[PDB]
Design a protein around this nucleic acid. Structure first.
Lengths: 203, 108
RNA sequence: AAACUUUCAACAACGGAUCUCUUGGUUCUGGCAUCGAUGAAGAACGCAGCGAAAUGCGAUAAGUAAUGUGAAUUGCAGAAUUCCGUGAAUCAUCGAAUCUUUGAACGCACAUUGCGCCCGCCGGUAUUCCGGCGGGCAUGCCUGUUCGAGCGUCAU
RNA sequence: ACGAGAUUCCCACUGUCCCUAUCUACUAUCUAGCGAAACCACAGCCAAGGGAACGGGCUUGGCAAAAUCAGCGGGGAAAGAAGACCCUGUUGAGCUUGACUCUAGUUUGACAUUGUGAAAAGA
RNA sequence: AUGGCCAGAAAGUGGUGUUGACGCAAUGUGAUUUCUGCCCAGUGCUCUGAAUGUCAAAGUGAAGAAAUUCAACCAAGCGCG
RNA sequence: CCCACCCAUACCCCGCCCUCAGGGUAGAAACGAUGCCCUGAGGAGUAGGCGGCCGUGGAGGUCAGUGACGAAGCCUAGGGCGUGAGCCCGGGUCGAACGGCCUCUAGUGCAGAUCUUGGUGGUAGUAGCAAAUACUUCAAUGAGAACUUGAAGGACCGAAGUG
RNA sequence: GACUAAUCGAACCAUCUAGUAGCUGGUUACCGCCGAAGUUUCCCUCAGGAUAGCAGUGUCGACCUUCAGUUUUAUGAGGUAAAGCGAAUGAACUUUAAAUAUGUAAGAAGCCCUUGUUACUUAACUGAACGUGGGCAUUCGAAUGUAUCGACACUAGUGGGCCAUUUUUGGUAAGCAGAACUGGCGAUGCGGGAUGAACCGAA
RNA sequence: CGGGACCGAGGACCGCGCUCUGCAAGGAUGCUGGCGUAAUGGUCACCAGCGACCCGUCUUGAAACACGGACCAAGGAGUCAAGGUUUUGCGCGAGUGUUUGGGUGUAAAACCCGCACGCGUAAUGAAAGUGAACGUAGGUGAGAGCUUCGGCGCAUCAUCGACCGAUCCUGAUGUAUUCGGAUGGAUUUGAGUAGGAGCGUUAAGCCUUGGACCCGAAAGAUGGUGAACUAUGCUUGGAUAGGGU
RNA sequence: CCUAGUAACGGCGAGUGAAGCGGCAACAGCUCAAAUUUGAAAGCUGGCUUCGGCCCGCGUUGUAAUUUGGAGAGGAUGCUUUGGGCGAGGCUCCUUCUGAGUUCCCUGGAACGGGACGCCACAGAGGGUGAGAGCCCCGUAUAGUUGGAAGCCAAGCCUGUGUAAAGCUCCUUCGACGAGUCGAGUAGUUUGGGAAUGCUGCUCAAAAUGGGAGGUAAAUUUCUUCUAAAGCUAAAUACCGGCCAGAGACCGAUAGCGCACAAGUAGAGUGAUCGAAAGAUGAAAAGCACUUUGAAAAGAGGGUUAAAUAGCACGUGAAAUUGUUGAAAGGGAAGCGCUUGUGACCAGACUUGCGCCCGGCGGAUCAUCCGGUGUUCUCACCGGUGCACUCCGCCGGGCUCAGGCCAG
């Protein structure tokens, strides 16, 4: 299983520039942080659940918050990308739980936000006052607003009187019955339709 | 290293069905036998449960958090009631959990 | 016995190995984005007191200006530099210029230093002739200007 | 008729021989000057023996005396002979043909370019 | 000559062609003299002479809920004569 | 038929080398224990397999390493060690660096390839230096004159020319 | 098939390109320890393959069980020589019995008895097979030899060669041609055959 | 009882012995002479006696043939990468692997961090799917080691059983009366379970693919350059005594 | 990075081969066409300008504002939003400047070598200087420190305020959305998508909850996702070209690029193109004055140099091959092995050691005891005591033993 039948020597990529590229990336990050100070170096991201049945046990960071999440948090969609919040217009909220989690995330960020006035001599009422502008800040939203609990807890404890009775017949029999019903959903519907037609014909 | 090779010494002497667009994530269901079930409990709590200092509590184990979807039934269990939450379970694994005095809860 | 041929040694030849050296290669890494009708890359021909080449330069020709430095250059010759200075130097920098004939190459040509056209200026007796000098004259396309063509559509 | 085409004969003619001899020039030769190359495992007298039909070197004999010059063409060397010939190929290439698969050209049909009126036969 | 024989990738392309059968093109034979053993009809050459016998694509009909399937019809060539 | 005698790397005895095998060696006065001591047997080798050592360029560590009072290199009818590849020293030449030990590393070891590049022999002072008719005398120049010049002669091209 | 710049049955230049070759040539220090092989069996052959066998390094297992190109004993094959027929009968006669080499067997892992079953077999619970239990250690039931074990792993060459004694099968005018075993050589020096792939001695 | 030759390994004692004040008994001492340096010894050159083919290379069984080699110096040919496999060393171990990345730095080093992921921890089936204890993880026979001397028995081997999946047959209680598939059998099968052994790394051997030990072919293809030679043609020029018929 | 050598494709099989998810690096979003400004083309190129504008025009076959599906338009409703100008300070790039021995001795032509005594070090990187230099010189380290230009960022501070534009919340309603295009057939090509891929040509050719996709062909009924046929946009990514810079367990003049040199040069070819060889005197030319022999080249003396055994043939100067000198051998090969011999030339070894007995010197680090100290805790060291029948050296004799080579 050796794929060396093409002119492979023309397209060999070595990586001797790995430490140099790491140094260049760190220099670029330092320059971006110095240019963006006192703002954090990154944008606030929502918590999303990974697709497919393999990865839906785990949550991670998404692209941006939804318009519904911004509306429920009270943050206008034009103000949001100017105060460090990422916006994603494609994503929708199919269920209430993720919507509530991301709305609470936005409200925590809004409670921790310090908003400097556009003009120092003319502050507005949406702006943070000068007596509150001084506080210990964070510069990594991926760290301070990360995924705290990416998986469910793998172990809890309950009293022995709170042990559930379980599904009737057993979980194995419940799984077998669910698979059988899914396989026979159409045949039983056709049989019921034929029986109803026969009953209507010979009532 | 070239000085250790034999060349230096030899110097002077020379079926079934096809499945189009297979997605492996459809078939993700890792399995754990019941003889490894107590190893998912943290060590101090596991030793307390096995010693018998917890006679009023039962451990609830989420297999999907540990990365398992099916509970298989190789081995034997101690006589301690355990709540197990799993996507799939074998008949023998359920039978052994029920003898141990716990229950297998189905999740998705 | 010598000579000759061969062997061994010393010194001398022939030749350029060995050793040591390296203003050069080779590979990797890091930084930067900047050619040309405002005429590029390339080519030719020239330029030094004494050069054929390499280098630099373009009839302002081993260079001019400007800025900085501050006493050379050097193979020969000849001159320095008021050294208490608008200042040496094959110096460095470089923002101002010069930049022959060409070349995408542009009046038409070019195997020719061939032949033109337009407009000014100057000189030779000069309204007519002769000569010199300066500025122009390629193609495709765009925007606008102005001059036009066609019962193509009309009004009067 | 013509012919640097292939063949047999006749007369003349004669150094083709018989049968060789002699002369001239230029070389070869010697000297002064100048000055290569091919080739070269090592070397070079033979005889008999050396199973594989081969000896220069081994065995047994004949023998065998420095250093040289002109010739010579028996071996040994010497042929762009690593040629030519024969044999072999996962052989190469040119060429031929109802060998295979294709194909330029040619030919035939259909759709499009493709419009305006008639008359007749079928829907 | 709305042609023959060629050329070009194509072209509002070129040649033959400033050409027209006493011409142009392709063959075979090879001055003159001599000279066409006798007769066909198998292969071949050519006849739009009747056929659909073979019969592509397109088009036409039948069934089917449709994919599709089945039918005729069917140019040139081949075949037959 | 008989007696004596000759000699193989064969056989016997002895020494030495190596390999293999079997033993001994700590209340350590005790050892490159990867050592030392005792005993026995065995020894050809192509294809092939394995082990140990020697050498070359470069790297880390180390030797308080060598060196202009002479490094490296080279020559040597001068020596010492090793079965061997090799190692070391003396003498001569020379002029600026180099080596030992343990690890690391490789563009690491030549007699052959009608090799590659460069250099050099025998042949050998040899083969030739022989088409185009041809040269000679005196003087001058000069270190030196057949093939320079002047004069004096003799010849050739022979007008489809050596013009 | 001439000529197209000394190049022509398809010129020259650069590139693809370090094109491919199974064919030719070459392939670089020393010492030590082992050390080979030519139809064995299967496959359509030549322009063929695998494969057995023989080798070296590692290990491991109780390196435990013993085993053996040998003799003897018992019994086969070779009854073939031979003795007698005052034994019978007449190589084919036999009381007895050759030589050369040759097959099989020779223990506690063995032998025998008993009990059942049988889906084997037999007229048959009869033989045989499978189990069951028991007895036989009083000598473990010839000789000689025995640094000779076993099982893995990985690696390598050679796997339809030459000569010769013997046996055997065919042949030729005469030569000779197939097989089987064994020995030698290819891989090998030494003493002797004056000399030397195949001889003698000896490694 | 004589005569001669070659050798002297070892290095306190220990032993077997005897002829027992000692010895010839587990290996040489004693006495004496010359010389003390090229005398012994060694190296080189040569003579003498005996011995002794020219090296690779190729071929087959082997020779012979054939091919290469005038001489010398310097280069000069099993390498690197990826992926397997077995063995050796090392770390951790049901886990293992920091180095894609992030942090940090005395800055390509070293040090530190973690989500995911890879391999392993479970297999079987074409698939849907199902998925590994009757037993101190079984019985019997061996088996190192240990033993309280009765036995316990590692690894491993042989044999009989048990469990999981696949195949075939039967089809229980139940029931969306057409689903469900228990129980019991029979064949093979799988490096399956039956008290985990793997993951990472180093070193060596072998494969497998790349130019792949080095040097070569006749070739094939892509794009360019030539009619100064020569072939043919067009345009424009030049040239060729004297005789015979 | 992983997915993954997996799904899949593949004569007679050699082989080929993605994607979603997941972790990370980097992240950034938007503009049109389809609407009547219609109570006012509100838009724009060019020319002339007194810089106030004014003209020639483009354009209604549509130039501004508004809207882009995330929506929007119309309403309703009540709150919020905005324009300019200074600017401390910081950063980027060139510029002035930076520590310490030429102290003494020896070798040497020359110290930059050896020895002694110092000093600097946020500098002991590198190079030069007559041989290995931290302190002779350039540089090197570090904070800064002179002078200059152009940008960027930025703590804050002055002012205008609502004519107008903008955001938020709700809603009956409305809500235009790209055509020879999508799609279908067929042909070629391509792909893992030779049932599921893309592209292009020809023919046919759409629609309005429509259309595309949902990797096995079709009909029926559902569902899920987006919204094609118009357009812009930094970063993370690539880099055998160019420019600048720093490095290496790389090569060391037949190596490394073909080229360390007047190298893509000289040279060759009609041309396309092909394409070398070739570095080193010495620290300093001090590159040989002068004499003499030769026509000259040169030779010989004699200087120069540390050395000409460095003479512009030039560091070192191997082998092949050659000359001279010295030695030897040779009757059709030499070379080589074992063993003597001759000649020539050499390495070792040896030269005396140790121990007793006398005699003569020169000294008390003899034994014991005391104190101090260290140790291995019983052994030592240091200071006092020796008073010479004891220790330690030296010199004369004598004796034993052991000593080199060859032999009987």
């Amino acid at each position: 299983n050796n794929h060396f039948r093409k002119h492979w020597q023309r397209r060999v990529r070595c990586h001797f520039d790995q430490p140099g590229k790491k140094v260049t990336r760190r220099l670029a990050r330092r320059a971006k942080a110095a240019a963006l100070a006192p703002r954090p170096v990154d944008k606030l991201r929502p918590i999303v659940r990974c697709p497919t049945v393999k990865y839906n046990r785990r949550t991670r960071l998404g692209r941006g918050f939804t318009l519904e999440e911004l509306k429920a948090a009270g943050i206008p969609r034009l103000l949001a990308p100017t105060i460090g919040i990422a916006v994603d217009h494609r994503r929708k909220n199919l269920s209430e739980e993720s919507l509530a989690a991301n709305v609470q995330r936005l409200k925590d960020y809004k409670a921790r936000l310090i908003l400097f006035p556009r003009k120092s001599n003319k502050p507005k009422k949406a702006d943070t006052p000068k007596d509150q502008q001084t506080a210990e800040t964070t510069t990594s939203l991926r760290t301070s607003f990360g995924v705290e609990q990416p998986l469910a807890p793998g172990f809890t404890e309950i009293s022995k009187s709170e042990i559930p009775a379980g599904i009737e017949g057993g979980a194995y029999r419940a799984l077998r019955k669910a698979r059988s019903d899914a396989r026979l959903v159409g045949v039983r519907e056709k049989r019921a339709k034929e029986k109803a037609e026969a009953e209507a014909n010979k009532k | 290293p070239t000085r250790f090779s034999k060349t230096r010494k030899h110097r002077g002497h020379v079926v079934g069905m096809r499945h189009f667009h297979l997605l492996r994530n459809h078939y993700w269901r890792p399995s754990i036998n019941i003889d490894k079930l107590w190893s998912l409990v943290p060590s101090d709590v596991r030793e307390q449960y096995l010693s018998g200092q917890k006679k009023d509590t039962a451990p609830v184990i989420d297999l999907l958090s540990h990365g398992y979807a099916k509970l298989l039934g190789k081995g034997r269990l101690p006589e301690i009631p355990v709540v197990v939450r799993a996507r799939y379970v074998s008949a023998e694994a359920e039978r052994k959990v029920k003898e141990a005095g716990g229950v297998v809860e189905l999740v998705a």
